[PDB]
Ligand binder design. Structure first.
Ligand SMILES: CCCCCCCCCCCCCCCCCC(=O)OC[C@H](COP(=O)([O-])OCC(O)COP(=O)([O-])OC[C@@H](COC(=O)CCCCCCCCCCCCCCCCC)OC(=O)CCCCCCCCCCCCCCCCC)OC(=O)CCCCCCCCCCCCCCCCC
Ligand SMILES: CCCCCCCCCCCCCCCCCC(=O)OC[C@H](COP(=O)([O-])OCC(O)COP(=O)([O-])OC[C@@H](COC(=O)CCCCCCCCCCCCCCCCC)OC(=O)CCCCCCCCCCCCCCCCC)OC(=O)CCCCCCCCCCCCCCCCC
Ligand SMILES: CCCCCCCCCCCCCCCCCC(=O)OC[C@H](COP(=O)([O-])OCC[N+](C)(C)C)OC(=O)CCCCCCCCCCCCCCCCC
Ligand SMILES: CCCCCCCCCCCCCCCCCC(=O)OC[C@H](COP(=O)(O)OCCN)OC(=O)CCCCCCCCCCCCCCCCC
Ligand SMILES: CCCCCCCCCCCCO[C@@H]1O[C@H](CO)[C@@H](O[C@H]2O[C@H](CO)[C@@H](O)[C@H](O)[C@H]2O)[C@H](O)[C@H]1O
Ligand SMILES: CCCCCCCCCCCCO[C@@H]1O[C@H](CO)[C@@H](O[C@H]2O[C@H](CO)[C@@H](O)[C@H](O)[C@H]2O)[C@H](O)[C@H]1O
Ligand SMILES: Nc1nc2c(ncn2[C@@H]2O[C@H](COP(=O)(O)OP(=O)(O)OP(=O)(O)O)[C@@H](O)[C@H]2O)c(=O)[nH]1
Lengths: 115, 51, 344, 55, 48, 171, 54, 320, 98
């Protein structure tokens, strides 16, 4: 119950600061003030248009590497096993396969940003 | 067996390659200035950026 | 593709099904399914043309949905029986959903609209894998649970697919789509006889594979992909016409050819089990298949279609493409009925 | 009246027609995944209903 | 001599041929030995 | 507290309902983040720990990459929220009320069955080893390094092949 | 052989004498087609012959 | 071993053999532009291999006996007949054009195969890239039909994208009056009937399409008539070309391997030239095609496969 | 347990329903699939924790791993279709109708 209490207290503190920030200041709302910002000149186009991601390949590769992280995170409890040799062999194979995948991607220019 | 709909259908390309209506690449248009920390105050560099 | 990618991708395509058929655990069978699904897609999209990408996307979405439904079935069976295999006591809806989702994976009707499109999009040498090697795993998953399946659902799907494949075959001019529809019909027979005697389902799978692979390699020979295109073999490669005719007729299922043995034996089993109406209807509707194969035979072997001036240089140039496996499979598929007793 | 017309219409040509009508009814699909998966949804519902009613 | 591009299959691949003939004779010998052994074992297990 | 777990499951249902209604991918990612958090909490309340935290971590990473992809490809001049489309809004409210009414109906027809709102929270945990020590789910998961090495082999191969497959799909 | 030229983008030429003889001869050939009275012809021929001789 | 993935793994990497003079130069020009002399001389000086211009008999000359075959087998298209009657109602003009395009495609495949295999360079006299000029000229003059234009463009779309363009193009520009003068001097009875309008259309197509299109990727040099002579000058220019422009730069071992596999199989090369588009000019009837095929498949040495013709002088058949 | 399993099954059902009926953007369909993945993992996790079966807790992690791999493949396919057509709209994926 303690963790819930403290997290709710943090939420309430942040939200209270926001509400004070929105209801205390004196305001004046008008179109020119409200309109978006772009270095003093009007937007040539809206910011919702497609924005090419030049690291898409590395971004996807991150997914698989993070799942490998997941597979590895049990090691602190694994080492408390009796089959230490088996655990060692399996972890070594896993990490070496990780390294080989990364090395192949590197040698194949996966990490070089796309232009 | 042609029917009402299948009249507008056309034979598929011999090689699988299909001629497509060109996709114009529309680079975004940023305004690197005038009021930018790196524009030295009075440059409206109209950058045309891809990504 | 570089050699290492070829090795890994092909090895994974080979691994997936082997895991599925050598796994005692439902989660591991699901792992085999996912292996096949993931590994096939790069081979499909190898060409990187607009049609290829769309075919790969269709395959991906459909197969992912099927895999999730199967995984739900597995998880609910776990919730019920504390185990990872289907038991006689397992809830009926779980088995119904498994049959339904493996039907979607296999391409059976009415979940069949996806197969023709993907087959049309993808190249022939991968169409062969799609219509042969990728069916072994799902059908194995069913066969391992055959005693518990639902006769009503299975017969409904089977007859639906026979009718749908037969009707779809007529309209199509494209060889790739024609072979997709033939796949649908033959799978319809396979599932029709699955609940009663899976040995004959496996017999039909074997004969269908042994007949389709030769035909796909025949198409690969001249990259033929249309009725008009295949019509030019009398000029480009006359020798193959005889065996192409025999093989199309066998797939249709005429008596002297092997194609009869699957249908005849399956009808025999169904009649033994008193499935007269479904057996009759399936046998009747399996003749549209002979019709839309006979049209091909007419176009290629029995009549000589107009040719082009430039085929003369194709004549001049030499050819070294037909394999030994083509001859072996073609003969052993279209001249083996007298050894039928050993097959069953 | 009979041999060249009515018999041909009744036995061969009626069958030929009906089957062509059915192939042109079924095969022509617009080819969109949205509609295809809608049909798969209808299959879902129908199997559920059959299971329920047959108990 | 007649052909401009050297015929791909100009002379027999002695290696492939010798392998094929050797495999065939070995297969026939093995099969005959196996058939004899099977007959002998059938007689042995069924009292002639 | 009696209604703790049921409330969490209902919130999960609502988040999944929003995702199914399919707003713009940005709101889809936000909804799935909330749903992943609630699911992690359900797992935590069911005695789990490592599994809930792992789902939360992996899902945060996945939605990060997904958002990056959406800003680039899955974008529109006017992204549609849950409330923007009147049909989406109406069916959101309809789904909420429908689930409420379905809960009531199942409770009424089966007083004890799939749902036991009366007696709710009385069957969350079934058994616990009171004086045990090694009962933590991390142990079961780590078993992949000893008793279930086949699981590790297949999963590691899946990721390895994923590297090559992704590179060649994106070539 | 010079490892580098100070100027950026101007890469070292392995066969400078051959390249120069080739270019100068080509120039002297194209000049023949100018009218014999052309001041350009006269001056450019003097210049090119000087450098070719060097 | 046939070049395959196995040989590629074990060696036979194209980049291992490529050298400075391993290029694909294409000499181009209007009729009687002196192309042949310059082509031979460039090839000789640079140590590369010269490929004469593809004719109606190219496939026959390069396969089997190497002897020119009958025209019925070799396309039934006559250049002399084209000049005598260019609008003949038997459709000889477009038949000739399609056959020449297909033969140029075959020659290009052979030259690319040679380059990627031996590592030697190749010099060519016109190619598939430059071939469209003649078709455009025929269409403009009115000798061929718009459907034939459509057909040729379609086949080029199917075939051209697969192969890498030539490294450098060397275009000889000679004005139409002097083209006519040279043709008169050559004094071919049937060639003398080519019209100035036709020659000017060829020249216009060249300048207004081919050179602008090639300069986008290849390295394009233009020599007038007076510069064309003294080929040593052109060899010098080729020597001091620097190719920083073109699809060639981004290739590597595996792309070269797939191109090699495509070219090695001459069937795949010519597959799309036989698309079953039923255009009367190229379409042949079943009876005539069957007669031609039966006649061909009993010519001395063309009944069985290259290695199995006992009549010509092959033996060990019972073992092969 | 019972109410939780009912709500989780309903959640998976709704996400499956969302996947089956599209709505233009392919990315949203991928997200719906991913949500079904979440629900299935939760089902397995709660079942295992309820049964105290620590030998089956290795399996939800395998579910996550393989679902992540397929999601990555899906994202790559989205990238390719976007390169082809300029958007991820599923309407454009209609060529193979012929
Ligand atoms: C019920 C349960 C039991 C079920 C049992 C299973 C039932 C049967 C399963 C279904 C059968 C379908 C099988 C499909 C096989 C593959 C089809 C295909 O697309 O390949 C066409 C393939 C074309 O090969 P090819 O004509 O020699 O092409 C020339 C190569 O390019 C020549 O150059 P290459 O070197 O590139 O050759 C290909 C290369 C490529 O190898 C790889 O890519 C993978 C390994 C790369 C290592 C680097 O492989 C190698 O040579 C090794 C490289 C060293 O032909 C076939 O294999 C079809 C044969 C029919 C088999 C059916 C048997 C049914 C019984
Ligand atoms: C039955 C379905 C018939 C479909 C129509 C087939 C057809 O029209 O043939 C092509 C026909 C075009 O014939 P063509 O233009 O004169 O040249 C084709 C020859 O292969 C030109 O090639 P060639 O003259 O170099 O080789 C001729 C070949 C003769 O090979 C053939 O062309 C005839 C092959 C079909 C024989 C059918 C046997 C009927 C079985 C009765 C049970 O060899 C012989 O002269 C005698 C060898 C002994 C006969 C070969 C039998 C080997 C396969 C047996 C498998 C049986 C499957 C059942 O159209
Ligand atoms: C620990 C450090 C962090 C603390 C963060 C919190 C900050 C707390 C600051 C304490 C001071 C509280 C008074 C702030 C007033 C700020 C806004 C203001 O000045 O409004 C004047 C306004 C001005 O009155 P007015 O509305 O008549 O002014 C004229 C209005 N126009 C221009 C429209 C004609 O007076 C107020 O009503 C403010 C009431 C504040 C209580
Ligand atoms: C039952 C109906 C559920 C909601 C139907 C929404 C409207 C609809 O037409 O269904 C298909 C819908 C795609 O609709 P759309 O492409 O946006 O075009 C709308 C044209 N009026 O597809 C969708 O929007 C997905 C709907 C998922 C509904 C999940 C929640 C249902 C709760 C009951
Ligand atoms: C009791 C059971 C036994 C009875 C079984 C009867 C089954 C007989 C099936 C015969 C089918 C033959 O199918 C035949 O297809 C050809 C195509 O060339 C059609 O051919 C005709 O079609 C239409 C007329 O409708 C014309 O436009 C066309 O030019 C003409 O060729 C025939 O009209 C049809 O009869
Ligand atoms: C109980 C099952 C029994 C199955 C056995 C019978 C098989 C039936 C075969 C059906 C297919 C016959 O295919 C037959 O094709 C011809 C043309 O080829 C169609 O006939 C067509 O002719 C021309 C175009 O070609 C059109 O002008 C005409 O309107 C159209 O109908 C017939 O309408 C169709 O019936
Ligand atoms: N109608 C037509 N004629 C062609 C085509 N390609 C070549 N020709 C003809 O083939 C002949 C080639 O002319 P040439 O110039 O003498 O060929 P070359 O001898 O190799 O090179 P040159 O030095 O210029 O003479 C011309 O009559 C022309 C074509 O595509 N269509």
């Amino acid at each position: 119950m303690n963790l819930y209490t403290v997290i709710f207290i943090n939420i309430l503190l942040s939200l209270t600061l926001i509400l004070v920030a929105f209801w205390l200041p004196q305001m004046n709302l008008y179109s020119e003030k409200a309109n978006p910002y772009e270095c003093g000149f009007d937007p040539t186009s809206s910011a919702r248009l497609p924005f090419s991601m030049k690291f898409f390949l590395v971004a996807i590769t991150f997914l698989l590497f993070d799942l490998e992280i997941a597979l590895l995170l049990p090691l602190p409890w694994a080492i408390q096993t009796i089959k230490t040799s088996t655990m060692m062999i399996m972890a070594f194979i896993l990490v070496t396969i990780l390294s080989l995948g990364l090395a192949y991607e590197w040698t194949q220019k996966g990490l070089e940003w796309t232009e | 067996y042609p029917s009402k709909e299948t009249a507008h259908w056309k034979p598929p390309p011999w090689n699988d390659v299909d001629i497509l209506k060109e996709k114009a690449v529309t680079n975004m248009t940023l305004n690197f200035g005038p009021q930018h920390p790196a524009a030295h105050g009075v440059l409206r560099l109209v950058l045309e950026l891809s990504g | 593709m570089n050699p290492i990618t070829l090795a890994i991708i092909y090895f994974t395509i080979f691994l997936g099904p082997v895991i599925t058929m050598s796994s005692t655990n439902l989660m591991l069978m699901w792992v085999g399914l996912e292996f096949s699904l993931l590994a096939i897609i790069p081979m499909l999209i190898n060409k990187k043309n607009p049609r290829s990408t769309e075919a790969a996307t269709k395959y991906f979405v459909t197969q992912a949905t099927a895999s999730m439904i199967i995984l739900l079935a597995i998880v609910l069976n776990y919730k019920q029986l504390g185990t990872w295999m289907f038991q006689q006591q397992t809830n009926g809806l779980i088995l119904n959903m498994t049959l339904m989702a493996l039907s979607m994976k296999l391409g059976l009707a009415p979940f069949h609209f996806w197969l023709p499109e993907v087959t049309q999009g993808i190249p022939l040498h991968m169409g062969l894998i799609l219509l042969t090697w990728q069916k072994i795993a799902p059908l194995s998953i069913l066969i391992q649970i055959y005693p518990l399946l639902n006769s009503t659902i299975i017969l409904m799907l089977a007859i639906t697919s026979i009718f749908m494949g037969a009707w779809g075959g007529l309209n199509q001019t494209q060889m790739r789509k024609i072979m997709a529809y033939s796949s649908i019909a033959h799978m319809g027979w396979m599932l029709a006889i699955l609940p009663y005697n899976p040995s004959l389902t496996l017999l039909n799978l074997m004969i269908y594979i042994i007949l389709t692979a030769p035909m796909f390699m025949a198409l690969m020979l001249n990259n033929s992909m249309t009725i008009n295109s295949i019509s030019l073999l009398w000029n480009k490669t006359p020798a193959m016409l005889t065996m192409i005719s025999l093989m199309l007729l066998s797939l249709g299922g005429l008596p002297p050819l092997t194609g009869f043995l699957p249908k005849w034996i399956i009808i025999t089993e169904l009649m033994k089990n008193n499935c007269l109406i479904m057996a009759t209807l399936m046998a009747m509707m399996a003749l549209l298949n002979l019709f839309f194969y006979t049209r091909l035979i007419y176009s290629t072997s029995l009549t000589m279609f107009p040719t082009n001036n430039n085929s003369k240089m194709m004549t001049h140039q030499t050819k070294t493409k037909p394999n030994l496996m083509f001859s072996t499979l073609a003969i052993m598929s279209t001249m083996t009925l007298p050894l039928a007793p050993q097959l069953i | 009246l009979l041999d060249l017309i009515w018999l041909e219409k009744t036995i061969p040509k009626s069958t030929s027609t009906l089957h062509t009508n059915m192939t042109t009814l079924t095969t022509n699909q617009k080819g969109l995944i949205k509609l295809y998966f809608m049909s798969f949804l209808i299959n879902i519902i129908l199997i559920i209903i059959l299971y329920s009613i047959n108990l | 001599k007649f052909y401009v591009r050297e015929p791909v299959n100009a002379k027999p691949n002695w290696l492939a041929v010798g392998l094929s003939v050797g495999a065939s004779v070995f297969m026939w010998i093995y099969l005959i030995q196996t058939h004899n052994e099977d007959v002998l074992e059938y007689k042995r297990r069924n009292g002639l | 507290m009696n209604n703790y777990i049921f409330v969490l499951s209902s919130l999960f249902l609502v988040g999944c309902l929003g995702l199914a209604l399919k707003p713009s991918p940005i709101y889809g990612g936000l909804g799935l983040i909330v749903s992943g958090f609630v699911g992690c909490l359900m797992v935590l309340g069911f005695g789990g720990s490592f599994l809930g935290l792992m789902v939360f971590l992996i899902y945060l990473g996945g939605m990060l990459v997904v958002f990056g992809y959406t800003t680039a490809m899955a974008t529109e001049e006017y992204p549609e929220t849950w409330g923007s489309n009147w049909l989406i809004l109406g069916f959101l409210v309809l789904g909420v009320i429908m689930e409420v009414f379905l809960i009531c109906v199942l409770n009424y027809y089966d007083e004890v069955g799939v749902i036991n709102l009366d007696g709710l929270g009385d069957w969350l945990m079934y058994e616990v080893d009171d004086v045990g020590v090694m009962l933590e789910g991390g142990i079961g998961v780590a078993a992949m390094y000893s008793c279930a090495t086949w699981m590790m082999v297949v999963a590691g191969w899946s990721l390895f092949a994923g590297i090559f497959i992704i590179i060649e799909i994106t070539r | 052989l010079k490892k580098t030229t100070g100027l950026v983008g101007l890469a070292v030429c392995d066969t400078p004498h051959e390249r120069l003889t080739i270019l100068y001869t080509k120039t002297l050939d194209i000049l023949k087609h100018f009218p014999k009275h052309a001041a350009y012809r006269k001056y450019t021929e003097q210049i090119t012959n000087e450098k070719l001789d060097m | 071993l046939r070049y395959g993935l196995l040989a590629a793994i074990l060696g036979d990497k194209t980049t291992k053999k490529l050298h400075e003079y391993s290029r694909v130069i294409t000499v181009d020009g209007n009729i009687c532009s002196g192309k042949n002399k310059l082509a031979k001389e460039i090839a000789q000086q640079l140590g590369m291999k010269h490929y004469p211009e593809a004719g109606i008999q190219y496939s026959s000359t390069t396969t089997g006996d190497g002897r020119p075959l009958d025209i019925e087998f070799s396309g039934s298209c006559s250049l002399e007949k084209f000049y005598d009657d260019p609008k003949s109602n038997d459709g000889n003009s477009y038949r000739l054009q399609s056959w020449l395009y297909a033969s140029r495609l075959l020659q290009y495949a052979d030259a690319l195969e040679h380059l990627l295999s031996t590592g030697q360079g190749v010099v060519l006299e016109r190619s598939i890239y430059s071939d469209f000029v003649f078709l455009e000229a025929m269409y403009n003059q009115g000798y061929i039909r718009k459907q034939c234009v459509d057909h040729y463009n379609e086949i080029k779309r199917l075939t051209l994208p697969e192969y890498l363009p030539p490294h450098a193009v060397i275009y000889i520009d000679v004005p139409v009056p002097e083209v006519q003068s040279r043709i008169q001097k050559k004094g071919d009875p049937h060639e003398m009937k080519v019209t100035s309008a036709y020659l000017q259309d060829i020249e216009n197509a060249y300048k207004k399409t081919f050179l602008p299109k090639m300069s986008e990727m290849c390295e394009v040099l233009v020599y007038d008539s007076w510069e064309a002579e003294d080929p040593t000058k052109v060899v010098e220019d080729i020597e001091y070309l620097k190719y920083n422009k073109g699809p060639w730069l981004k290739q590597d071992d595996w792309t070269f391997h797939y191109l090699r596999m495509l070219v090695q199989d001459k069937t795949e090369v010519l597959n799309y030239t036989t698309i079953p588009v039923y255009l009367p000019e190229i379409t042949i009837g079943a009876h005539q095609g069957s007669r031609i095929y039966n006649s061909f498949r009993e010519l001395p040495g063309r009944k069985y496969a290259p290695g199995y013709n006992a009549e010509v002088g092959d033996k060990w058949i019972w073992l092969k | 347990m019972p109410s939780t399993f009912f709500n989780l099954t309903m959640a998976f059902s709704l996400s499956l329903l969302g996947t089956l009926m599209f709505r233009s953007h392919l990315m949203s369909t991928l997200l719906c699939l991913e949500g079904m993945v979440l629900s299935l993992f939760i089902m397995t996790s709660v079942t295992s924790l309820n049964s105290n079966s620590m030998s089956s807790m290795p399996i939800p992690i395998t579910i996550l791993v393989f679902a992540a791999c397929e999601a990555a493949v899906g994202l790559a396919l989205l990238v390719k279709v976007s390169n082809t057509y300029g958007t991820d709209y599923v309407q454009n994926l209609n060529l193979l109708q012929c």
